[PDB]
Design a protein around this ligand. Structure first.
Ligand code: NI
Length: 313
């Protein structure tokens, strides 16, 4: 029976990445919303899956402490350099948040007030497949419910990696696993509802009509507007979901997902109304997304995430 680690209960198995807490708050970032796969299994210790490894992460004011569970295969040891470089990339630590916050507050009076309390909110750089199917599950859904759908989906379809205490960790499934003749039926038993059909159909579509997961990497290299349009050809992927994926997995920092909640924030906190009829809609939604890119600049999606974190708490 292997156990989740804490920094005190096994110090020899942890490795540090220098990182001030003003650049990264784990409790604000790893909290369900961007990813649905991290859980605080003991206080201040976040455990979750990256690719095919399980990690536990914790931090001081100055350091990000990391430990990785490779399975029953290897002898237990500290994270390697390359494994740490993965986390560095995952948290996009090359991007200075202090500078971004400063720039956003300079033209946005409301962001300034809000951001004081909620520093260290950045965007994870997520796997496109995981991101796509997680956000297909997000339509007309809440975070708690999405988290359950995603976990149950991984448990039924993805490979087992390891078990820690009562938690069995699964990798996110590949396209082929989600595309089969039984997939939708199974996913309905897991409670996805109508979302079940879109998961299977989008997996099939990518495989049969786009040339497999290599297509998702091409979108990572394509410009935001083309990637966004391409994603909107998938079953169940409209503007909000395409924008989520653009921002969180295809390196498009200007992508700004718009739904009824963003509409709320914008109207209440920014006084925004559409300069158009509106008797929400796709053109009005895009206008709101344009309002925020106009206001915040090319990292508008990142600024939005700060506000979404502040509102949720
Ligand atoms: Ni009004």
């Amino acid at each position: 029976h292997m156990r989740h680690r804490t920094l005190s209960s096994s110090p020899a198995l942890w490795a540090s990445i220098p990182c001030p807490r003003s650049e990264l708050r784990l409790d604000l970032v790893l909290a369900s919303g961007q990813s649905f796969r991290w859980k605080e299994q003991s206080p201040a210790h976040w455990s979750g899956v990256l690719a095919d490894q399980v990690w536990t992460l914790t931090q001081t004011e100055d350091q990000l402490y990391c430990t990785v569970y490779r399975g029953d295969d290897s002898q237990v040891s500290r994270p390697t350099l390359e494994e740490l470089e993965t986390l560095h990339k995952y948290f996009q630590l090359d991007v200075s948040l202090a500078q971004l916050y400063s720039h956003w507050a300079s033209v946005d009076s409301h962001f300034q007030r809000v951001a004081q309390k909620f520093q260290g909110v950045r965007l994870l750089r997520q796997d496109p497949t995981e991101c796509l199917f997680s956000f297909i599950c997000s339509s007309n859904n809440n975070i708690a419910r999405i988290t359950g759908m995603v976990e149950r989906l991984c448990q039924a379809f993805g490979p087992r990696l390891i078990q820690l205490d009562d938690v069995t960790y699964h990798g996110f499934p590949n396209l082929h696993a989600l595309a089969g003749p039984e997939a939708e039926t199974h996913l309905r038993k897991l409670g996805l509802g109508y979302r079940a059909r879109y998961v299977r159909a989008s997996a099939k579509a990518i495989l049969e009509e786009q040339g497999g997961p290599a297509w998702l990497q091409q979108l990572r290299v394509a410009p935001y507007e083309e990637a966004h349009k391409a994603l909107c050809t998938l079953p169940g992927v409209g503007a909000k979901v395409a924008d989520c994926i653009c921002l969180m997995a295809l390196d498009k920092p200007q992508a700004v997902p718009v739904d009824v909640h963003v509409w709320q924030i914008a109207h209440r906190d920014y006084g925004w109304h559409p300069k158009t009829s509106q008797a929400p809609s796709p053109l009005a939604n895009k206008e709101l997304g344009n309002f925020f890119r106009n206001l915040w600049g090319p990292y508008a999606g990142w600024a939005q995430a700060v506000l979404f974190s502040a509102d949720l708490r």
